[model samples]
Target: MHHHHHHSSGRENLYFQGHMASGSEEEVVSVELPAPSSWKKLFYPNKVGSVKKTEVVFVAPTGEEISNRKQLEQYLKSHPGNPAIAEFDWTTSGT
Candidate 1:
């Protein structure tokens, strides 16, 4: 038996955090997707009144830091972004 998994074309919010091509430090950037959201929910459940926001950051090498904003955006686009929807169940009932 085989299980078929279909992915949604929805856009996801992609946040980046790490070294950049400009040789900068941690920089944050955010992008959006239609479907397939971030899977972080599997470990961190969505809390009440908790707004979903994507924060991208770049962690540069020791003694390295981001010099410009364009690099942040460029770096973000370079890496694959998080899914728009979590693969696992994030919704739950309050006890």
Candidate 2:
């Protein structure tokens, strides 16, 4: 599960990502702003989307660098100001 916290006097978002697994059973979740009503969502003008101060990115096994910036823009066309998620990857470790 992922946890997001408020930082810098509740001005920015802090996120952590991790998960728990037992054999074939595993659960994963990404959560943000644990303390609701503490701060407003950050927004940038001329930027229909806002940049998250921090994000917990998962690593893809395929070792590919794919971007969703264009995809996000397309989705916003139909969704209109709403955001959609696209998968990407980063560094990962397994033991």
Candidate 3:
């Protein structure tokens, strides 16, 4: 008795390639994304909403505004019990 096993052959590969190029539109599918970051830059826009301030601003859950590293440290100290306080690494704002 003889038995056949599924295998990849040149003809099978050619057929599969032709089948894929049948010009059938592919459907959009769902996708996974990275978890949202808790900290994001605060874009304080100008009057026209076209331009934004040069300085990078950050806000806290306690309604505290931070523009510099010292402010962040003080804010955290002031709100030690605040669970929303997160560690951030900031450098010179020059861009």
The models' CA-based lDDT, in order, is 0.36, 0.32, 0.48
Off by over 4 Å in 2: 1-25, 33-67, 81-95
Question: Using lDDT as the measure, what is the rank order of every candidate, best first?
Answer: 3, 1, 2
- Residues 18-95, candidate 3, lDDT per residue (tens digit)? 454556334522222222154444543334434533444665655566766677677667766543434453432232
lDDT of 1 at 44: 21
TM-score of each: 0.19, 0.20, 0.35
Off by over 4 Å in 1: 1-65, 82-95
Q: Write model 2 residue lDDT over 1-89, tens digit each, in one string.
A: 88988656656666664556456423433333211131112211222225332333321123321233354345446554333332211
> Cα deviation in Å at residue 58, candidate 2?
14
- Between candidates 2 and 3, the lDDT winner: 3
10 residues in a row with least lDDT, candidate 3: 27-36
Q: Report the number of the highest-TM-score candidate.
A: 3
